[PDB]
Amino acid sequence: MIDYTAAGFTLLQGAHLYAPEDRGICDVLVANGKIIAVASNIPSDIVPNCTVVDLSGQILCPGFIDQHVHLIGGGGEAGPTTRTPEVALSRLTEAGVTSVVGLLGTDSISRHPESLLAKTRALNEEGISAWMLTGAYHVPSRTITGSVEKDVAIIDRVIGVKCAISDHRSAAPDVYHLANMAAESRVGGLLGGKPGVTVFHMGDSKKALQPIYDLLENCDVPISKLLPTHVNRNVPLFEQALEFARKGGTIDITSSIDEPVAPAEGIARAVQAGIPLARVTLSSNGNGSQPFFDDEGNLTHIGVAGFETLLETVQVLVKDYDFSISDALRPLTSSVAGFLNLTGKGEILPGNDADLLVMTPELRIEQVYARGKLMVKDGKACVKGTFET
Amino acid sequence: MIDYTAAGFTLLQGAHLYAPEDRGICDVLVANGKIIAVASNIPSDIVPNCTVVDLSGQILCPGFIDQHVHLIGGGGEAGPTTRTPEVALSRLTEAGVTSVVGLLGTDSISRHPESLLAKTRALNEEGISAWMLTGAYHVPSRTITGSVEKDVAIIDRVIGVKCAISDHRSAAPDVYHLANMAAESRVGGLLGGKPGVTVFHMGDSKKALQPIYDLLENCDVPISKLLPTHVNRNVPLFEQALEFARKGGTIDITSSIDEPVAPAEGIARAVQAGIPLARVTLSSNGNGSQPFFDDEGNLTHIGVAGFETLLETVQVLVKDYDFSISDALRPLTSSVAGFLNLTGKGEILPGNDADLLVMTPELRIEQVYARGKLMVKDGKACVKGTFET
Amino acid sequence: MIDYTAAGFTLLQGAHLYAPEDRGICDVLVANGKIIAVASNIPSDIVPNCTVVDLSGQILCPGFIDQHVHLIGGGGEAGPTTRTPEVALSRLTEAGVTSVVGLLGTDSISRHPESLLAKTRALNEEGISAWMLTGAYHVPSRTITGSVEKDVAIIDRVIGVKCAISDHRSAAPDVYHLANMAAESRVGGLLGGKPGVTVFHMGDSKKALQPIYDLLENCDVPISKLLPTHVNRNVPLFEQALEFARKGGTIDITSSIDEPVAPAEGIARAVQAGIPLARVTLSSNGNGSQPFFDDEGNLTHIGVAGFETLLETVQVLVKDYDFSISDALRPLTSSVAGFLNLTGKGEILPGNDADLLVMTPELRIEQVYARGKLMVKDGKACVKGTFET
Amino acid sequence: MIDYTAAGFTLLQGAHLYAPEDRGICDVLVANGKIIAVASNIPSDIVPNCTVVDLSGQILCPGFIDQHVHLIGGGGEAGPTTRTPEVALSRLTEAGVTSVVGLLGTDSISRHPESLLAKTRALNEEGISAWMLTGAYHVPSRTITGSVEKDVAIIDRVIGVKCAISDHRSAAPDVYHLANMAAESRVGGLLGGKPGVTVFHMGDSKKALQPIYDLLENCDVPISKLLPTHVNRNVPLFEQALEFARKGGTIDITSSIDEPVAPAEGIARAVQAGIPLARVTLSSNGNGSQPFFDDEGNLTHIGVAGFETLLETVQVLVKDYDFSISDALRPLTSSVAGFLNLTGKGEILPGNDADLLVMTPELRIEQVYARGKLMVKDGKACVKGTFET
Ligand SMILES: N[C@@H](CC(=O)N[C@@H](Cc1cnc[nH]1)C(=O)O)C(=O)O
Numbered sequence A, B, C, D: 001m002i003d004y005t006a007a008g009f010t011l012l013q014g015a016h017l018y019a020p021e022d023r024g025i026c027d028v029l030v031a032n033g034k035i036i037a038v039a040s041n042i043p044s045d046i047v048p049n050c051t052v053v054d055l056s057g058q059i060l061c062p063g064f065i066d067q068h069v070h071l072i073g074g075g076g077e078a079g080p081t082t083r084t085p086e087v088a089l090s091r092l093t094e095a096g097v098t099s100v101v102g103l104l105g106t107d108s109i110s111r112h113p114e115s116l117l118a119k120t121r122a123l124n125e126e127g128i129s130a131w132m133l134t135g136a137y138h139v140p141s142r143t144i145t146g147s148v149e150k151d152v153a154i155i156d157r158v159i160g161v162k163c164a165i166s167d168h169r170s171a172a173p174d175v176y177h178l179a180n181m182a183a184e185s186r187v188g189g190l191l192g193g194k195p196g197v198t199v200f201h202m203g204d205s206k207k208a209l210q211p212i213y214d215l216l217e218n219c220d221v222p223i224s225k226l227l228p229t230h231v232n233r234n235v236p237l238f239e240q241a242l243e244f245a246r247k248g249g250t251i252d253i254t255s256s257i258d259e260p261v262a263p264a265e266g267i268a269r270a271v272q273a274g275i276p277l278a279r280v281t282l283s284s285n286g287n288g289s290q291p292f293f294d295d296e297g298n299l300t301h302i303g304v305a306g307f308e309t310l311l312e313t314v315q316v317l318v319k320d321y322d323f324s325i326s327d328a329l330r331p332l333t334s335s336v337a338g339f340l341n342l343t344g345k346g347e348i349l350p351g352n353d354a355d356l357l358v359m360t361p362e363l364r365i366e367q368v369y370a371r372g373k374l375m376v377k378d379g380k381a382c383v384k385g386t387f388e389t
């Protein structure tokens, strides 16, 4: 016998496939971590040493891309005891996350981009796909090489920069600082082949999106590189976000915020307003703290976010909102890959990566493939982090 | 016999107690530097090896908290010969100060935060409680670690930052500098578990509080973290301070300034205006120089402040103003502890620290306990600094 | 009734006390986290609202002090996936550990003293007692303030410095760099009130202890500040370690190494050698990686150390080594506290901290108290880390 | 029909395979740039849309790996006009080179690691595989991040460091500087998953290898991380090089030097000396200047090295040296990949990268495949650099 096992041939048979586009019942051929063929009825013997998988009666869709996760831990708003813990592989996979963008938040004193970068690498090495944003809430940005442009341009996992605005925990940056930072990300992105975005954590300040508007009037960074996140945190901010998207910007809704605008609600609303789903993404904020502040900017309560809200949002949208599953998936898949220009991700096409979700019809996760590898079986991780126990 | 002396049991019997709230005649049980019980009639044998103290006919109240003292010396406005000297322990205790916040002023060239920090530690070790502010008049701030946020976040004794505005000795900072500095203090405070305030020395400039208003319009720092000090220095500034407090800010009156608005006068006025005492504090400016300047910003005269004005203010308020003692005490006790979130200080409650003042009925200090230890006896220090002589 | 609960009075009765010294049957009284009385037969009613614990039939001893723990995680010798996780509270308490000293190892790129410091602080807040060493294997040391000397003098929790010698992962330092470093720690120590020690991770190099000796002739740092650790990792090193202890040095044996010199064996050998137990300590290296390198410095195997070996060593010593329980506890209690000058630790005496272990006669942990708080009950943590699962 | 082209299936049939091991007549199947099967007689229809290549009568072997190439240009020893040009893709592929390691030489003023890195990245994108060494002749090293150790641990393409010793253009470094540097590369290597080697350009100094030996006694870096290059440049050096290899070291012979020790001659001598071929590598120094200096360190002659000598050496060895083709290829394939720990390179095994050469029986290159892509056809590049003419 001849051994063709190195190929990792895998045939995924007869699931109802959402690419996210409804492909109906379709097969998927995988080799070396890549989708090599997608079509109705694939001869299970088309290739040697092929592992056949019957997904009849099941749904197949692309793995989620969570562009907002505190991979190394976050928190700290109430002292050191509130420093959250690092993210563990199985937590991600089990929630259907095959691709992630790690970032830092409030604390950039006991939290470092070098550590975030190491964790990002560990995850890629463990089996999934991971990137990161340089910077943190603090502006000017705390980087690895000393320059935002140089970080985005030269650190392979860095794709953009993070900052915070309209929030009582910001560093009170002025327009110039913001503009420059954005411009540097923009430029380091062309050079490095990164999207070069700037992600803005939004707080509850009444100024809302103003800083983003000001910034626009003060530089030549395309509206397409700027991402306001946690837009559902408050009404008036949410409403502003809608017009921002309508002007051509993309807005990121956080799944970990149920009030005042719940995730599925925000998405449905966007759509009511005429916003194209391609301009709406959804992220978890996993492992970040969920601190609530007083009227005096006083902390009262503090929790930690998880990844389960992702899937839940989908379910709700489908289930309580009348979205088609296809539509329901976009913001976690194709919309995100689109905004971040994440190649080979977000869609089920030949040549793309074999990052797939096998779900039951009532949208429950059974299996997860990350780059062609079986990570989750029967809704449970079969592959765990080097130190998960 | 069994030895239970390690406990330092101390029963303080039958004084009329102001917590600052009028508790009438009440006893106070202390152990290991802490108030363990407060109630009418405590069995002098409730605990073993208990030291009983009869304060019948006397008043008992909490130790003062002076949040504005040049612990290492200050001055310098008229040359090196005008560099004031360091503060000595007994000077504090004798004036009823059991808790202090050290800071720097005009000179941050021959004066250093590292020195201030060492002195702060020496004082805690000698018997009282001491903290400090990083920075000085100079903006941008001269810190220990190179960053305001990092100092507040990581140096255990640092609780906030100092600066000067509306004064001919300021560094002429612009709104951005101010805003950022404040924001950094704010944020380093959450992380470090410090109040994270910004204290503004106010000069006589006609702009008065404007800079604070501007700052507000340019960042998201809660009005509750900003403290304008020496507000009584001039009328129009004083008047502005009143509305600032009324908007929700706290104002600090300096006891060492008799004109144009004397300390008790300012406090009474605040109250006439409807300001809650919780939003009014009083500090000494002890060891700082008291320089007076010309019309041409020319120095004429220069003196050095002491701590006796603290007690005097209380006396006057009670004596010439009709405040209840309870009310009279707030600004030196509960109001200060409240603003700085100084835990276990400012009030007489079980679990709080045994920082107490024993006074005669005509408000004269007889004894002082700092953390359960007898520091002053019969109005005189029994415990002196390592080098006091 | 009068409320005296703020005192947390606790009376631990009837156990067989090892302080570590054998004190036969004897009671212990606690108030405010401190030991206030130690005597046979204390009256269960000597003080109000007392919680009495019947320890009859049990054994009572000081909590362990582990001076070598990778609090924020370690490892990374085989890439990013081998970066070990941070330490959880419950894992320490459950191992009998009430005081700990945190440090960095091989990686000081993705690992930072600022993060280590935040963690040390987190643990102090959560209930135990933590300190840290500045630096890492890398010499020159990477510090918080930019100076070893400054780090030790001004960062409250820093008590000395870590470095690596005689190991293929060292930074190839020369005596000058080592001497200067040790001298800085010594001096910072005097200034800040710290022991100001230099901790040397020893590797398998044939040079063994040579560098230390060289350093001793190139400076005037007292031998008593120089701590070689992991001395049992190889024989010739171990034997050299005995001479060094013999000359006045203290030596730290790693409980996580079972070959070629088992921990209990090392201790017994030290003693048979005429080295007083005061000059022998034992530490775990918990959370650190346990990497194995072949012939050509190639990594063959990697694992993570836990805390169980601490206790095990004690059992073995008593059991197999003819040791008295008293002597057997020294190396984890009094010797350590003595070496690092840890006040209020390692010994059960009035005035010390209520850090104690309740064990069965066969040496199994049952209860653990930290600063008088119950952390472990029935061999199980009843107090957990803010983010423990 | 079903489309399976995303797979790039390619079946290379009938050649005489040297993997390098002689495997007689044997086929090779490729999919997605990887070798998925290696066996005699694979079925031309085993997989769909297969491109079958008749290599009958040819020879198939691994692509060459050149670890010493001045990718961005070099030279400059005789002023600015002698700065050599950057390497073009086609020149590498055409020389049989599929993997390359880039470095700097004498000039690190007009030459920068950031530029070298961009180039390495350009080549990876264009189709081959490239890595780089940080540093240059200059010691201390000029780096990207400011630290050798950091450069190696965090810049993905950096795998070690370059330096110059025993040469009149060295920076006159001392053992400490050398030892520290090598130790940093070693450690960064472990952290980032790199070999973490130190590459020593050797010059004609009488000191020859002394510095290496000195370094070995001043540190604990494994001999296997230390690569002396250009060892054939002079005799006594060369002879010393044999002893070093004999002690466990690996040695790099330069194909661009024909006197006094020809490349093929050096290799044969190494072997006759008992040095396994695994410890002998051969590199070109392509694009580097070939300067000649007279008596008094005066430049007499300058030229630029090409890549043709690589192949030539192989031919000569076989031809004139009694070598088997197998052995003759080691030094450019398996030995190199082995030394630098290059995974998926230097050997034709299922799972490795499809980097292969098609040669005539007389050893002339015909085709070249890189990661399964056809780059050279008929001895001519059919793939060129984005800006190649
Ligand atoms: N700050 C957290 C991460 C974070 O942004 N959380 C959100 C949670 C939230 C959003 N809206 C209300 N709460 C925040 O606004 O704070 C950290 O730094 O980990």
Ligand SMILES: N[C@@H](CC(=O)N[C@@H](Cc1cnc[nH]1)C(=O)O)C(=O)O
Binding pocket: B070, B073, B074, B075, B076, B104, B105, B106, B107, B201, B230, B233, B257, B285, B287, B288, B289, B290, B291, B292
């Ligand atoms: N500057 C002094 C401390 C200080 O602020 N004193 C006050 C005294 C004052 C207030 N109003 C009039 N005089 C000042 O306004 O100068 C130093 O630096 O020691």
Ligand SMILES: N[C@@H](CC(=O)N[C@@H](Cc1cnc[nH]1)C(=O)O)C(=O)O
Binding pocket: C070, C073, C074, C075, C076, C104, C105, C106, C107, C201, C203, C230, C233, C257, C285, C287, C288, C289, C290, C291, C292
């Ligand atoms: N490397 C660890 C800390 C450390 O010093 N471990 C020792 C463990 C050991 C001792 N003997 C064998 N293994 C080592 O020699 O590696 C980290 O950095 O986490």
Ligand SMILES: N[C@@H](CC(=O)N[C@@H](Cc1cnc[nH]1)C(=O)O)C(=O)O
Binding pocket: D070, D073, D074, D075, D076, D104, D105, D106, D107, D201, D203, D230, D233, D257, D285, D287, D288, D289, D290, D291, D292
């Ligand atoms: N100098 C070159 C790189 C380099 O090391 N070349 C060797 C070439 C050589 C070896 N023997 C004779 N000539 C040198 O000794 O000069 C550059 O910097 O481009």
Ligand SMILES: [Zn+2]
Binding pocket: A105, A201, A202, A230
């Ligand atoms: Zn956020």
Ligand SMILES: [Zn+2]
Binding pocket: A068, A070, A104, A105, A285, A288
């Ligand atoms: Zn976040």
Ligand SMILES: [Zn+2]
Binding pocket: B105, B201, B202, B230
């Ligand atoms: Zn002032």
Ligand SMILES: [Zn+2]
Binding pocket: B068, B070, B104, B105, B285, B288
């Ligand atoms: Zn002052």
